Amino acid sequence: IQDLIDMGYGYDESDSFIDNS
Amino acid sequence: PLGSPNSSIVSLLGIKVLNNPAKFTDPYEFEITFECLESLKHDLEWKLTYVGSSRSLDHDQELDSILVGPVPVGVNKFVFSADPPSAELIPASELVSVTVILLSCSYDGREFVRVGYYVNNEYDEEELRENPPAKVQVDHIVRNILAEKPRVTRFNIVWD
Amino acid sequence: VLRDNIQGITKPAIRRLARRGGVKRISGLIYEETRGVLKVFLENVIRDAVTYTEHAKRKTVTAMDVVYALKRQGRTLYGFGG
Amino acid sequence: ALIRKLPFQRLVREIAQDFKTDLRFQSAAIGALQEASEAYLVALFEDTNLCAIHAKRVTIMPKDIQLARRIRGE
Ligand SMILES: [Cl-]
Ligand SMILES: [Cl-]
Ligand SMILES: [Cl-]
Ligand SMILES: [Cl-]
Ligand SMILES: [Cl-]
Ligand SMILES: [Cl-]
Ligand SMILES: [Cl-]
Ligand SMILES: [Cl-]
């Protein structure tokens, strides 16, 4: 469950490829 | 009722390789024990595939296939005596080497389980092992199936 | 745009993963081989992932889209009846 | 993670856009893919190791990797 919480962390969200809306 | 990854009516309980090790040209004697939960309309289709080359699927050999049915509910056992591969269809550089055999079962053309084994091929004489002949001497090749370490891959299919 | 990002997967990363799998020594040939396999896996899963995404009339692949795609590779266990 | 996330992100972006350029990912989606990719490669190397061992060899070869793919029912 802890891995699920941290799963999205650590990537370059500046990338237009990433949409976290 | 309960959410489950596996919904298969049929599941394997064990497989014994009766003749191991064996000559390259010996048939494969698989004693297959499985469980069937419900009655099924169609038969089970077992296939044995030999990987002739690790570099591509172009040299795969379907060794044998058997239809088993009608399948009764409960624990079942049968012996699948599958034909050996053809040496001449295997690249000579890859014949006396380790490879893979795939024992799969499908229902109405839908594969639900695939059992992989490693198989090593080796000459039965020390001299031949140290110095492989230019032409492969098939009658001196012994195969060894790693029957204690099968890789069992289950798939989810629609049954009846 | 940049290409050949499969080369971004480094040699020590590949050795790292191999060691975790119990493999201590790998030759130079293993690197490109592993990269090839990794690309194929990623391609296959992303294909299946998008299928779940487009079916939901969306353009952004979500984590659950990936999970559903992963549930199709089939479960590989060691031994029978596990 | 055993792989740096930024190089993995670039790889995912490339493959995804080569499929359909009109496509975006959540960060947790990339994370899900990376965890699965790393787990898949580790398991692969385990069977790669087992292959070489049954071959009575001590060093893995490209063929061991390819055979490991076949044996895992890909
Ligand atoms: Cl099973
Ligand atoms: Cl070998
Ligand atoms: Cl030999
Ligand atoms: Cl064994
Ligand atoms: Cl290095
Ligand atoms: Cl990182
Ligand atoms: Cl890295
Ligand atoms: Cl090789």
Author numbering:
A (entry chain D): 122 to 142
B (entry chain A): -5 to 154
C (entry chain C): 21 to 102
D (entry chain B): 60 to 133
Text of the article:
In this study, we report that H3.3-specific binding by the HIRA complex is mediated by the UBN1-HRD.
Not surprisingly, the Asf1/H3.3/H4 component of the structure superimposes perfectly with the previously reported Asf1/H3.1/H4 structure (root mean squared deviation=0.821 Å for all identical atoms) since the differences between H3.3 and H3.1 do not reside at the Asf1–histone interface. The hydroxyl group of UBN1 Y132 forms a hydrogen bond with the side chain of H3.3 Q93. UBN1 D136 and D140 form hydrogen bonds with H3.3 R72 and H4 T80, respectively, while the UBN1 N141 side chain makes hydrogen-bonding interactions with both the backbone amide and the side chain hydroxyl of H3.3 S86. UBN1 residues M128-Y132 sit in close proximity above H3.3 G90. A comparison of the structure reported here with the DAXX/H3.3/H4 complex reveals that while the histone chaperones UBN1 and DAXX share no sequence conservation, they bind the region of H3.3/H4 surrounding G90 with striking similarity.
